[PDB]
Structure formats: structure tokens, C-alpha cells
């Protein structure tokens, strides 16, 4: 799981999730991950080096294999260029005249037969291609919400975990934004899931805490000043 | 070829048998259809060569279990604490070359398993 | 989901019947996940129809099948004496196999 965790997956929001569905050579299972090189990269399914999500992966002898030879998988060999992450080629040209024989075909098929042991038995892939950002989340964990207070509390809005105090909002937020950035990069105003308010982040009271205290060999009665804070605070 | 089947109380543990050719037992999948009388064919699960990873349906996970002979290729069935609705012709479908694993290729002859008091 | 198909049919010898087939679903991989079966009565049944895009080896040429969405079709022509039996539609497209409500086939003559 590239970005995430295996296990700390059910607490967060996502944007859109795609599953990508294919199945690959045991011994071929090596470049399905960012920046990677090969046939079966550059050729058929490469991975983009910002790639965030669980590249599952598990053993598939036992259903896509057959003795007599299950030809219904192929994999292109041949191409002109190198694929683009998350690209997808089905064209059955040639890689010379209109057959074949002298330029290749470059849709060959794989040999999957239980006779072939680890290596060459095929593996069924799973790309969870997961996209925590911004966006609006649509799809989220199985944690249940709680109410809404206003005016210093933890939150938690699709994922954001932090701690602050929550106001109504002025701002002006456009439909496809729901999170807000300030200069130090915090969040600063955030869109409920339920209800289409904005409220604002910020953080609860604080400041210095400095001692005022003369000598210990006279005395042990201290003063206390709050710096920056007033009184009424 | 089957074996008979024998008039059972429900909580006898009968058992069912049936006899196929024409393929090697190794790599093939393997299961047991159901078709009561006046209904359809109902599918319990299949049974692998090798390592038996076994795939029940969700109406037949604790109902039935498969307990196939690989040694003489001759598939069984083991039943425990039976019922009055188990009657059914039970027919013995592999997976056969012609399509996937989960397509049944071939089929058995069927015995119809009566249970009577 | 359950498969639904008619109870009875009422065909003739040398016309066509078309069996139809609804409520098969589909999963990530394909869609043509339809296979039909052949059971006489009181017979064993045997592999007809699967994979309707191709030809079963034995099956003869005048067993054909169509999809359109969810809906399937059995096209069976040259009716004959012989043809009285069973047929079920089967889907497997979640790895989950299921069966029709049986459909029973008659000629006129």
C-alpha cells in the first residue's frame, strides 16, 4: 500500500476509487509499482511515480489455468512506443504487408497450465488506486458521525483529524471545494459531509507563560504573567 | 454407473455415489448438483484435485459436505443430521476443457435419494 | 437474483422456439457469463449451450443463443421428436452458480 496503511484504512475518506482488474505472469509480477521498467510496463499497464493505493496481488493457478492450455489471456509484446501510466492499448495491428509471417504479431498468449509451477502460474491484480486530497470525499470508512458543537474540540471531517475551535464562516467556498488552505499550510475552514456550512479552524488559546521570582535564598513566592493573553482570556 | 439409493430416517448419515471416465483427476474441478422433484437444478459447490478449496453455495455452507475419492476417481458425499427435504436427484458435474473453471464440462447420471418412515 | 424463464413452451416440429432468460448479472471481467444445459427426462444432462459467442464440439449447428442487457435467448431451430426435454439457463459471472425455474419444451405435430 503505497501512501497508506494495510490496516489504518477503514478511518479515512476517498475521493474516487478504481479497481483495476488484471492478471499477470507469476515471474512477470515485479514492475507493478511506480517506476518501474519491463514488458509488461511499458508495453501493457505502467504506473504512474505518484502512484497512492494497495497493489493487491494474489495467486490464481487454480481457476485462470487449464491442462489443455487456457489461451484467453494475452499480453502485447510489441510496440512502437513505451505505454503512459494508466494507459490502456487494444488494437490488434501488426507490428511489411497486411499478415503476418516475415513484422510480428504482437498479441501473444500465455501458456497457463497447473503442469507450469511459481513463476509461471498466473496472479490475479487488484490496483486500488486510492486519491486523498481536496476533493470531495464520496466514499468513506465505516465510522459512524456524532454531532456538531461550535465554539475547543477535536474534529474530524472526512479524515482531518486536528484540534480547534469552529465559527461560522464568512467565505465564499465554490461547490467542487471542500477543504481550505491558509499561508502555513493548515487548514483554516473546512465543509461539513452533512450539512453544506463552512466553518472555520482555528486554533484554541495559547501563549507564553513566563515566571517572575526573585532569588530562592529569599523568598518563594512566584508571579505568574500570561504574555499576550489578557486577563479576561 | 451409481449405487442405489437407500430408503433413510433423517439422522442416518447416508451416503451417495457416482462414477465418471474420460479425464485425469489432478487438476480438474469437481462438484454436486442437486434437483429436487418439481424443481430445478440447484448448485451446492465444487471440490479441487489438489489442495480442496472448496466453494459452497450460501444455501449449502453447513448443509452438505464433499468427501470425493481421488484414489479411484469415484466421488462421495457425507451428510449429517438430515432433513425431510434432502430428497433430491444428485448429479456429479466436472469442469471439463471446454470452458472455465466454474463451467461444468461433463455430468454424472444421477441417483434419487427417498426418505420415508 | 433469481433467473427467470417460462414455465412451459409450446413449439412445433420444423419451426423455431426462443427461450428467453432475465435476471443474469455480471461482474468485472465480462459479461457473457451465459451457459444453457440439456436435461432429458429422467435422463443424465449434458453441456449444450455455454459461451454463446461460441460452439460447443457435438452440439449441433441449430442450437444458437443472443444477449441483449440483462435478457438472454435460447434460439433453437429444426424441432424434432427427440427434442423433448429440459433446459436451464446458468449465470457465473460473481463465481456463484444459479439456475432458472426450468422450462419444459413441447412440439405440435
Known amino acids: 500500500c503505497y501512501g497508506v496503511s494495510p490496516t489504518k484504512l477503514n478511518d479515512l475518506c476517498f475521493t474516487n476509487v478504481y479497481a483495476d482488474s488484471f492478471v499477470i505472469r507469476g515471474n512477470e509480477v515485479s514492475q507493478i509499482a511506480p517506476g518501474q521498467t519491463g514488458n509488461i510496463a511499458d508495453y501493457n499497464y505502467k504506473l504512474p511515480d505518484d502512484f497512492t493505493g494497495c497493489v493487491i496481488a494474489w495467486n490464481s493457478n487454480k481457476l485462470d489455468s487449464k491442462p489443455s492450455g487456457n489461451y484467453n489471456y494475452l499480453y502485447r509484446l510489441f510496440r512502437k512506443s513505451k505505454l503512459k501510466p494508466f494507459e490502456r492499448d487494444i488494437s490488434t495491428e501488426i507490428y511489411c504487408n497486411g499478415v503476418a509471417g516475415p513484422c510480428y504479431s504482437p498479441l501473444q498468449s500465455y501458456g497457463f497450465r497447473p503442469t507450469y509451477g511459481v513463476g509461471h502460474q498466473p496472479y490475479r491484480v487488484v490496483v486500488l488506486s486510492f486519491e486523498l486530497l481536496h476533493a470531495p470525499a464520496t466514499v468513506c470508512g465505516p465510522k459512524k458521525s456524532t454531532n456538531l458543537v461550535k465554539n475547543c474540540v477535536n474534529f474530524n471531517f472526512n479524515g482531518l483529524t486536528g484540534t480547534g475551535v469552529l465559527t461560522e464562516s464568512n467565505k465564499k467556498f465554490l461547490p467542487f471545494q471542500q477543504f481550505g488552505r491558509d499561508i502555513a499550510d493548515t487548514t483554516d475552514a473546512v465543509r461539513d459531509p452533512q450539512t453544506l456550512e463552512i466553518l472555520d479552524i482555528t486554533p484554541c488559546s495559547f501563549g507564553g507563560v513566563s515566571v517572575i521570582t526573585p532569588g530562592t535564598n529569599t523568598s518563594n513566592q512566584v508571579a505568574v504573567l500570561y504574555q499576550g493573553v489578557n486577563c479576561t482570556e | 454407473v451409481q449405487s442405489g439409493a437407500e430408503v433413510k430416517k433423517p439422522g442416518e448419515s447416508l451416503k451417495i455415489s457416482c462414477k465418471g471416465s474420460?479425464?485425469?483427476?489432478?487438476?480438474?474441478?469437481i462438484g454436486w448438483v442437486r434437483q429436487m422433484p418439481g424443481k430445478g437444478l440447484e448448485w451446492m459447490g465444487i471440490?479441487?484435485?489438489?489442495?480442496?478449496?472448496?466453494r459452497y453455495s450460501p444455501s449449502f455452507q453447513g448443509q452438505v459436505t464433499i468427501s470425493a475419492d481421488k484414489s479411484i476417481s469415484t466421488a462421495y458425499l457425507h451428510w449429517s443430521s438430515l432433513k425431510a427435504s434432502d430428497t433430491a436427484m444428485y448429479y456429479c458435474?466436472?469442469?471439463?476443457?471446454?470452458?472455465?473453471?466454474?463451467?461444468?464440462?461433463?455430468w454424472g447420471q444421477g441417483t434419487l435419494v427417498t426418505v420415508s418412515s | 437474483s433469481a433467473l427467470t424463464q417460462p414455465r412451459s413452451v409450446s413449439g412445433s416440429l420444423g419451426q423455431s422456439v426462443t427461450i428467453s432468460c432475465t435476471g443474469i448479472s455480471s461482474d468485472v471481467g465480462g459479461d457473457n457469463y451465459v451457459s444453457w444445459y440439456q436435461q432429458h427426462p429422467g435422463k443424465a444432462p449434458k453441456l449444450m449451450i455455454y459461451?454463446?459467442?461460441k460452439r460447443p464440439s457435438g452440439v449441433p449447428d441449430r442450437f444458437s443463443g443472443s444477449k441483449s442487457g440483462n435478457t438472454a435467448s435460447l434460439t433453437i431451430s429444426g424441432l424434432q421428436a427427440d427434442d423433448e426435454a429440459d433446459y436451464y439457463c446458468?449465470?457465473?459471472?460473481?463465481?456463484?452458480?444459479?439456475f432458472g425455474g426450468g422450462t419444459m419444451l413441447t412440439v405440435l405435430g
Open positions: 459461451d454463446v459467442s
Open positions: 474420460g479425464y485425469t483427476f489432478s487438476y480438474y474441478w
Open positions: 446458468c449465470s457465473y459471472a460473481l463465481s456463484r452458480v444459479v
Open positions: 471440490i479441487y484435485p489438489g489442495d480442496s478449496d472448496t
Open positions: 458435474a466436472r469442469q471439463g476443457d471446454l470452458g472455465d473453471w466454474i463451467l461444468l464440462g461433463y
